[PDB]
Amino acid sequence: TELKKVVALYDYMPMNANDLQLRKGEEYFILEESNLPWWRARDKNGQEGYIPSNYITEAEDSIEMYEWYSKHMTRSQAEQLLEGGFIVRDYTVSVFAKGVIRHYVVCYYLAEKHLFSTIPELINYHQHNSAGLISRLKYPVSKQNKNAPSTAGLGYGSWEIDPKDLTFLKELGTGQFGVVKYGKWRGQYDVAIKMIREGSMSEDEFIEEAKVMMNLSHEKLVQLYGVCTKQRPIFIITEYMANGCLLNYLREMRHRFQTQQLLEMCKDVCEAMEYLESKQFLHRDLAARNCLVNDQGVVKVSDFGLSRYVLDDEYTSSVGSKFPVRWSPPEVLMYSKFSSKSDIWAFGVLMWEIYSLGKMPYERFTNSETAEHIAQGLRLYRPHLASERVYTIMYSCWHEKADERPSFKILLSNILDVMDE
Amino acid sequence: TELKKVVALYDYMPMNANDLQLRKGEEYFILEESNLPWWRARDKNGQEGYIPSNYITEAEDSIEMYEWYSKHMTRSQAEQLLEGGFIVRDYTVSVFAKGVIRHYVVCYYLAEKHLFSTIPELINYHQHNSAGLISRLKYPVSKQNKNAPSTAGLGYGSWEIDPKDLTFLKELGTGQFGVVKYGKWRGQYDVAIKMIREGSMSEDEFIEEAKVMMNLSHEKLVQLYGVCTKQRPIFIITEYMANGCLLNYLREMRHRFQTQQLLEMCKDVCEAMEYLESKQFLHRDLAARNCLVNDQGVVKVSDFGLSRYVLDDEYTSSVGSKFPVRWSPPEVLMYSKFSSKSDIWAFGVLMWEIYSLGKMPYERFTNSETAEHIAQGLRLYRPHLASERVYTIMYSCWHEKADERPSFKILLSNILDVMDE
Ligand SMILES: [Au+]
Ligand SMILES: [Au+]
Ligand SMILES: [Au+]
Ligand SMILES: [Au+]
């Protein structure tokens, strides 16, 4: 069929009339191959004759041809011969530097790569050369709504909020302590203002401890901006969450999210609970009703610690008619022993709330019924939207022994893990 | 001591008179650090005030700052947002391509490298960018005396050599068969011309088998160019070796080489013996006296097979007074059984010759004495210039059992191995 092509490695002047002249670099076609050291070839012009089979290589870009390459010339010999002057040998690329020689083994690639000290250096490189990537880095992707974080206070050193700077724009809700209205502070920044009905809380004890809660800053943690004592009944001012509480969101705003966003809702809360855990600050009543959702769908936890200052015994007492029994572990129901682990238990139930899109935990049971059955070993079943792995996480929160339950550090790790899928 | 420097990740307008204005990208100096969410900072202008500690990063080029970076935005979310448009996330570089997204894990380096299909591609790349190498490839190293290989014949299809084309330039030596003169063929190419005294060889048998030896081409193999029958006594024409035989070179040309070049002398011969082995062609009398050295110090083997056609019984007979007893294994001395293994044995002795700079093997002993002692188990001691590893190689050639001796393939491998050091 087709003729085998070769390249002349060396010049060859014909020694007689049988010979064909070879010119280095030029290409020739074999008419007759053989174990013999002479082959019958054809010039690129059509001229024919015999050429030394050792003076030629095979068809595509072989190696003996180019400048550098030096077969089996030892490392020592290559060093004697050898800024940036190089050669390749049996592979290995040897280079002269300042005087010294650097050797790089070729396995086609060296072995190592560009060793950048920082990510920005890496990015700067591939913005100039694709060097192995699918395309040169050309355009960094945007974030239409960047949004700055929350400041621990509305300016430095201001717990007191002057209601002259508060414009009551819209009523939004009606929390357990009073009417939650929405407004701008100094007619610029959005702020949620929560009325506290008199008698609801022991103001003196609460407000003094709000000073601490002020200095609790975290991106997934509904920022407490301040309070006002002059205007009574009082008013705690907090970060504005445009989509209201998570429970109502899970139930009445289902068109606003996909089931693949649920795990992220858990992650958001978990990041927040890790923070409160690190500050050894117990939330005391973690539940979907106490998480809020902002304009961008981010879930943040609110009303953390707030139950310590509720005067209504029916909320505080573990035997009370409105106590969060359905979110409470056995140790809280039996001996009112709150701890990080009680928050973790609550989180498990909160995870369940999220994945059942806001269904009431143990909805068939009474609070005392739930208490008894939990204590026996009744655990919330897997919601349909929760995968085996996700359920394993929320279930771990419900271990009857407190110290055997994960930490929010651990849970956060586990959640980011399945998010990968 | 020195003030801690930071960069503003976001703008911050002062909300009151305690606050210091932050401008994204600009740098600020901390006067007071703290677990509190507000830090006391200093403008690059000297202005002071409090800034949100969450609005700033630490001193050197952190990460949240640049365009791309997106913290913990899952692979799926990054895909929805995302030719060559990119972002970096927790690391991983995600890139848009044509539409599809390619993900590269950053461990700072990706994981892989430029994957070239050929060495010439590799070299072409680093000639433009040093990309991790000590310097960009700039200048390929030279080879002053390149020199073309040997052609199996002086032109295609010419065993017969017309002595009218031969210019007898200089006498050189005086081989066992006759005077070796040096000359140019057609007053151009250098050629060695070896006179064959009449009666020395059985010409008819030899010359006919020289036709085969003609088509034995190898770079470390003294090329047999041709013969002439018309002029008698005859004349075999061969490749010209300017430095004569290796034995005399090892003894009288010691100023011309270093001991580090010895292993290369062995390698050269071994490459040649591998070739003759592959062509199942026995050398029959391998020894330093039968190797030649060219102008560039390269050692090549000559007179291969030639002993089959020597008429003098005292050379051929294993009991003869001039038989190569000192280079012969037991099986050759006892039963005249030549094979590849007999050549390997000879090579071992040749290695010894080289590393004792041409000393006579068993010089104290007579040929019959050597024969007896070899047969008992006397082996040549390690010469001082031979390392333990080199000696191990030449020693392997001397195993009393033939089939237990290495092949020239194996030996070649072993020699290139210690050459590395
Ligand atoms: Au107020
Ligand atoms: Au149930
Ligand atoms: Au002649
Ligand atoms: Au000895």
Author numbering:
A (entry chain A), B (entry chain A): 214 to 295, 301 to 308, 315 to 322, 329 to 337, 344 to 657
What does the study report here?
Btk is critical for the generation of calcium flux in response to receptor activation, because it activates phospholipase C-γ2 (PLC-γ2), which produces the second messengers diaceylglycerol (DAG) and inositol (1,4,5)-trisphosphate (IP3). Btk dysfunction is the cause of X-linked agammaglobulinemia, a severe disease of primary immunodeficiency. The Tec family kinases have a lipid-interaction module attached to the N terminus of a Src-like module (i.e., concatenation of an SH3 domain, an SH2 domain and a tyrosine kinase domain). The lipid-interaction module of the Tec kinases is an extended plekstrin homology (PH) domain fused to a Tec homology (TH) domain.
We determined the structure of a construct of mouse Btk spanning residues 214 to 659, which starts just before the SH3 domain and ends at the C terminus of full-length Btk. The structure resembles those described previously for autoinhibited, Src-like, non-receptor tyrosine kinases, with the SH2-kinase linker sandwiched between the SH3 domain and the small domain of the kinase (the N lobe of the kinase). The crystal structure has two molecules of Btk in the asymmetric unit, intertwined as a domain-swapped dimer in which each SH2 domain has pieces from two molecules. The domain-swapped SH2 domain packs against the large domain of the kinase (the C lobe of the kinase), but Btk lacks a Src-like C-terminal tail to stabilize this interaction. When compared with the other autoinhibited SH3-SH2-kinase structures (c-Src, Hck, c-Abl), the conserved features of the SH3/linker interaction in Btk are the polyproline type-II helix conformation adopted by residues 383–387 in the SH2-kinase linker, including the proline at position 385, and the overall hydrophobic character of the peptide-binding pocket on the SH3 domain. Diffuse electron density for the SH2 domain at every stage of our structure determination shows that this part of the polypeptide chain occupies a range of positions and adopts multiple local conformations. The unphosphorylated activation loop of Btk folds into the mouth of the catalytic cleft, blocking part of the substrate-binding site, and helix αC lies at the margin of the N lobe, preventing formation of a Glu-Lys salt bridge conserved in all catalytically active protein kinases. Glu 445, which would buttress Lys 430 in the active conformation, interacts instead with Arg 544 and Tyr 545. Leu 390 of the linker (corresponding to Trp 260 in c-Src) is sandwiched between residues Trp 421 and Tyr 461 in the kinase domain. The structure just described demonstrates that the SH3-SH2 domain in a Tec-family member can assemble into a regulatory clamp, just as it does in other Src-like kinases.
